[PDB]
């Protein structure tokens, strides 16, 4: 529909709107339908002289391309360093948006020229699209002591950096330890549908940028992983799989003090814990397992539990009482 | 797979294909931004300039350079001048006020 | 207790004239007031800019003259323009765009009307004709320096505010003394006014007319240039014969900065100019 | 890269083959009323839910639309199950009710949640190590958040 | 059978020679972005030029000369008369490295040490 809007919108006089013709452009062709817009987001990021739509660009380029992880930071590739810093910080965003939820390395092994520069704008979404990736990965699947140990490095070199650097700094460093590991975001669901608040929360978060209370909109877009085993909505089960992997490659690294096969995983009471798209292959129900859905549990979700013997000892499990919470 | 491989491929060729006119786009904007730059880092080069004597080359593209008033000053040179004008004893011209060389004078 | 984070709007009215007025920018002391209208809080918009004349005492208190000021003033009014000033400039010629003690206690004498009170410098004299470098200062409060010193919110623009870096003047003496970001506004008429005068300025009248002239001058001066253009080529031709020993010699890094293509690759985009107005030539000969 | 112009009826004229199968399959309507997001692709499914009689299927398929997919087609889909039923009647109220609240998702989440949290005094204390009261003071309540 | 096989075969034999067109639209966007590259750091490099062009606004640096350290990392650099700027020297450089009697870079506002001289 709005083809024409945008299109009549895109020669504007004002560089804001022309910035909001691209913002506008990306929410209207999520999912990669398009390789005509495309064109002209990478023509404004080229041609035009003002750096706010240049920076402004390839953010809807990630949310159109949000699809495919592989084929986005080759073609941002050149654009890691740009001709001036703001393509640069954009490149730092769309990187960020592309490969976020994802174990992608081909923007993780950019972003070490990314971390060390003259200028604070890519030093800063450098640590900001370098948090968006690590978030829910391992490190005895990948080598990340590196983005680690410099992510580490800023709060001790707070002293001798930028004052803007720093709070994308340590605010990158909440990113790690949003939610206690547990929470993290998705672009899109189980389904292969996307969802509307997470593209919110993640494009009006990317536009703290101009105005910094606007980024409190990143919780819209959390996702947490877990499954569901939920069989009436009044009684909670126990639920017991296995995983047919190392229970230790999977934990929390573990801090500092500062004063070959798990034989059950330890998702129970449905707490199921964090859990990673790559250990819905390996999850295994058990044989011996007393009861059991209709539906064959074969990929994470959310799903019901069917009793299978329909006797007595259902065990009943209570609810917590009041606190923090209600 | 196999038949599904074709049309699954097509979506490569497109978007293999979107980075021609891409490419076209940035070596047709860049190198005008390259004379861009060219001709305003030209255009710092000045006739007006103050004209100094060289001393010693400390190390390479970074000099010293004897002022007209007697005091030494450290000036890194600038990349274009090649080496033959590093003669020790030359007669160099810096800028009035960037003070970087633009060319030595033939004594 | 408050305070907001402001950005300055410039138009190029304001500009010329302070361009004008540092054209005026003589050794001397000069003296200027900024006009506009405050809108909100945290931006503010010039528009009107005239310059006044010279005192021997230079810029002070006492250099401004209040019923000439507020009778120049008046007859702006009865004009199209009922702007109230929004704050006064000056130019500080050599020793630096920073703010003396007269500077300051004039800034704060006409600060006490408005808050805002902008103090810009222009110094076109050790700027360069490359870049127009300008910034707007700011006066901070003394009571403030037990607090943090600018709790100014929206950190972004402050990358572009590290531009001035001068590692004695804006940290050298930035305690007491801020300074304030500077944007612009171009509207379309003005785009394309100045564009077309622009392009017009480097255009010719009826544009025909200088054409077929350096299409002759291909005739009659730029074949010398021709000749000479062959002379630098063969006069490289000369040095890269030589090359071919040494490349059949060493192959391993590179010792000369001078470079032989890039050079001629231009002797040849020249050279091209008579290509060029050959078809103006068989345009002209055709109607 | 569809178009949707033959998309969406290629989906609705492929879900006609399950409802011919002796069970109807989940993945399949969840992929079509994903994409082709259709009131009348959902109004037969729903009301199969009471010719069905069967509980237990429906709460996952109701789960995941209600977790999914739309938010004005849901704004649209539970009024028209607000149509369905009573203006086995005690048994299909608690169903459609309850199917229709989306916060038991919300008070699970607040159990797991409130019983999976890990905080660690280095990271909040390396933030008050580095804590200035400008810039920072909101980096670091925002890494609280 | 034999369609699988032979005519989308060769279909597919021809979705592979496509594969070499997509080789050679490869290789171009491959040495076209290298050749992209090279103008980008050519053009950034200049740019980084007039990254030095403040640096040229400095009316170049001085020439320091200390003759004498001092323990309190407040050197005595002997300067160009009217000078003998003692002043701490920048932070990346030790003090110590710097011997006495020699000649070294010094800027000339902010008096921040470059690099030991012969
Ligand atoms: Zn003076």
């Known amino acids: 529909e709005a083809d024409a809007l945008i299109e009549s919108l895109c020669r504007d006089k004002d560089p804001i709107l022309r910035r909001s013709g691209m913002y506008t452009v990306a929410m209207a062709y999520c999912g990669s339908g398009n390789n005509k817009a495309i064109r002209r987001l990478l023509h404004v990021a080229?041609?035009?002289?003002?750096?706010?739509?240049?920076?402004?660009?390839?953010?809807?380029?990630?949310?159109?391309?949000?699809?495919?992880?592989?084929?986005?930071?080759?073609?941002?590739?050149?654009?890691?360093?740009?001709?001036?810093?703001?393509?640069?910080?954009?490149?730092?965003?769309?990187?960020?948006?592309?490969?976020?939820?994802?174990?992608?390395?081909?923007?993780?092994?950019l972003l070490e020229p990314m971390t060390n520069d003259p200028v604070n704008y890519v030093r800063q979404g450098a640590l900001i699209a370098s948090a968006l990736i690590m978030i829910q990965q391992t490190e005895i699947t990948c080598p990340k002591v590196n983005q680690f140990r410099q992510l580490y490095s800023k709060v001790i070199n707070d002293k001798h950096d930028d004052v803007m650097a720093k709070f994308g700094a340590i605010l990158a460093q909440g990113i790690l330890d949003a939610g206690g590991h547990n929470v993290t975001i998705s672009l899109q669901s189980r389904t292969g549908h996307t969802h509307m608040p997470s593209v919110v929360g993640v494009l009006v978060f990317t536009q703290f940028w101009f105005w910094f209370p606007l980024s409190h909109f990143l919780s819209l877009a959390y996702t947490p992983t877990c499954v569901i085993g939920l069989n009436k909505?009044?009684?909670?089960?126990?639920?017991?799989?296995?995983?047919?992997?190392?229970?230790?490659?999977?934990?929390?690294?573990?801090?500092?003090?500062?004063?070959?096969?798990?034989?059950?995983?330890?998702?129970?009471?449905?707490?199921?814990?964090?859990?990673?798209?790559?250990?819905?292959?390996?999850?295994?129900?058990?044989?011996?397992?007393?009861?059991?859905?209709?539906?064959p549990l074969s990929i994470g979700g959310i799903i019901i539990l069917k009793d299978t013997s329909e006797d007595i000892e259902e065990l009943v499990e209570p609810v917590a009482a009041h606190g923090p919470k209600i | 797979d196999l038949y599904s491989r074709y049309k699954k491929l097509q979506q490569e060729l497109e978007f293999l294909e979107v980075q021609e006119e891409y490419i076209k786009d940035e070596q047709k904007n860049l190198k005008k931004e390259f004379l861009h730059a060219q001709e305003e880092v030209k255009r710092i080069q000045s006739i007006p300039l103050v004209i100094g004597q060289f001393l010693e080359a400390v190390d390479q593209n970074t000099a010293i350079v004897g002022s007209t008033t007697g005091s030494n000053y450290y000036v890194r040179i600038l990349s274009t001048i090649d080496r033959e004008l590093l003669k020790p004893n030359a007669?160099?011209?810096?800028?009035?006020?960037?003070?970087?060389?633009?060319?030595?004078?033939?004594? | 207790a408050v305070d907001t984070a402001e950005q300055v709007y410039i138009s190029s009215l304001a500009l010329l004239k302070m361009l004008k007025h540092g054209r005026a920018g003589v050794p001397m002391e000069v003296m200027g007031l900024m006009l506009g209208e405050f809108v909100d809080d945290y931006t503010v918009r010039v528009i009107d800019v005239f310059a006044m004349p010279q005192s021997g005492t230079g810029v002070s208190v006492e250099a401004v003259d209040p019923v000439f000021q507020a009778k120049m003033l008046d007859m702006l009014k009865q004009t199209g323009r009922p702007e109230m000033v929004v704050g006064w400039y000056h130019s500080h010629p050599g020793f630096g765009c920073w703010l003396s003690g007269v500077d300051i206690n004039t800034q704060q004498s006409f600060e006490a009307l408005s808050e805002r009170a902008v103090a810009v410098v222009v110094?076109?004299?050790?700027?360069?004709?490359?870049?127009?470098?300008?910034?707007?200062?700011?006066?901070?409060?003394?009571?403030?320096?037990?607090?943090?010193?600018?709790?100014?919110?929206?950190?972004?623009?402050?990358?572009?505010?590290?531009?001035?870096?001068?590692?004695?003047?804006?940290?050298?003496?930035?305690?007491?003394?801020?300074?304030?970001?500077?944007?612009?506004?171009?509207?379309?008429?003005?785009?394309?006014?100045?564009?077309?005068?622009?392009?017009?300025?480097?255009?010719?009248?009826?544009?025909?007319?200088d054409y077929s002239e350096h299409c002759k001058h291909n005739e009659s001066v730029v074949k010398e240039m021709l000749e000479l253009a062959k002379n630098y080529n063969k006069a490289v031709e000369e040095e890269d014969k030589m090359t071919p020993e040494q490349l059949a010699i060493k192959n391993v890094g590179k010792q000369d900065p001078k470079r032989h293509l890039e050079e001629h690759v231009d002797v040849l985009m020249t050279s091209n100019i008579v290509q060029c107005l050959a078809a103006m030539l068989d345009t002209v000969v055709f109607k | 890269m569809q178009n949707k112009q033959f998309r969406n009826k290629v989906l609705r004229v492929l879900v006609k083959i399950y409802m011919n199968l002796e069970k109807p399959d989940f993945i399949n309507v969840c992929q079509c009323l994903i994409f082709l997001d259709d009131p009348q692709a959902v109004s037969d499914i729903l009301e199969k839910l009471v010719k069905e009689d069967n509980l237990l299927m429906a709460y996952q398929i109701c789960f995941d639309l209600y977790e999914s997919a739309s938010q004005q087609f849901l704004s649209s889909v539970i009024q028209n199950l607000r149509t369905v039923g009573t203006p086995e009647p005690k048994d299909q109220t608690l169903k459609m009710i309850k199917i229709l609240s989306g916060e038991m998702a919300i008070e699970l989440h607040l159990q797991f949640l409130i019983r999976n949290n890990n905080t660690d005094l280095m990271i909040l204390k390396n933030t008050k190590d580095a804590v200035r009261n400008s810039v920072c003071h909101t980096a670091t309540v925002i890494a609280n958040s | 059978?034999?369609?699988?096989?032979?005519?989308?075969?060769?279909?597919?034999?021809?979705?592979?020679?496509?594969?070499?067109?997509?080789?050679?639209?490869?290789?171009?966007?491959?040495?076209?972005?290298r050749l992209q590259a090279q103008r980008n750091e050519l053009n950034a490099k200049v740019r980084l030029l007039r990254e030095e062009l403040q640096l040229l606004q400095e009316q170049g640096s001085y020439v320091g000369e200390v003759v004498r350290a001092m323990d309190k990392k407040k050197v005595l650099v002997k300067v160009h008369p009217e000078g003998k700027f003692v002043v701490?020297?920048?932070?990346?450089?030790?003090?110590?490295?710097?011997?006495?009697?020699?000649?070294?870079?010094?800027?000339?506002?902010?008096?921040?040490?470059?690099?030991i001289l012969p």
């Not at chain 2, 007669?91 to 004594?107: E, F, Q, R, Y």
Request: glycine letters at 4%; charged letters at 25%; hydrophobic letters at 35%.
């Open chain 2, 91 to 107: 007669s160099v011209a810096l800028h009035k006020h960037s003070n970087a060389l633009v060319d030595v004078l033939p004594p």
């Open chain 1, 46 to 109: 080229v041609s035009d002289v003002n750096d706010d739509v240049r920076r402004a660009a390839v953010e809807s380029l990630g949310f159109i391309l949000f699809r495919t992880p592989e084929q986005c930071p080759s073609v941002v590739s050149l654009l890691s360093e740009s001709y001036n810093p703001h393509v640069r910080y954009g490149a730092a965003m769309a990187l960020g948006i592309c490969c976020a939820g994802t174990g992608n390395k081909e923007a993780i092994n």
């Open chain 5, 1 to 33: 059978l034999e369609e699988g096989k032979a005519g989308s075969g060769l279909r597919q034999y021809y979705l592979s020679k496509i594969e070499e067109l997509q080789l050679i639209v490869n290789d171009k966007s491959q040495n076209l972005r």
């Open chain 5, 88 to 115: 701490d020297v920048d932070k990346n450089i030790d003090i110590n490295d710097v011997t006495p009697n020699c000649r070294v870079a010094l800027r000339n506002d902010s008096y921040t040490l470059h690099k």
């Open chain 1, 233 to 295: 909505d009044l009684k909670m089960p126990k639920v017991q799989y296995k995983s047919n992997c190392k229970p230790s490659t999977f934990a929390y690294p573990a801090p500092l003090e500062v004063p070959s096969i798990t034989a059950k995983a330890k998702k129970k009471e449905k707490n199921p814990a964090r859990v990673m798209p790559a250990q819905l292959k390996v999850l295994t129900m058990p044989e011996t397992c007393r009861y059991q859905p209709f539906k």
């Open chain 3, 123 to 209: 110094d076109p004299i050790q700027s360069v004709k490359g870049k127009v470098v300008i910034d707007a200062f700011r006066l901070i409060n003394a009571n403030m320096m037990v607090l943090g010193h600018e709790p100014r919110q929206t950190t972004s623009n402050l990358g572009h505010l590290n531009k001035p870096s001068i590692q004695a003047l804006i940290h050298g003496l930035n305690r007491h003394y801020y300074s304030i970001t500077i944007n612009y506004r171009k509207n379309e008429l003005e785009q394309k006014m100045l564009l077309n005068l622009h392009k017009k300025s480097w255009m010719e009248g009826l544009t025909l007319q």
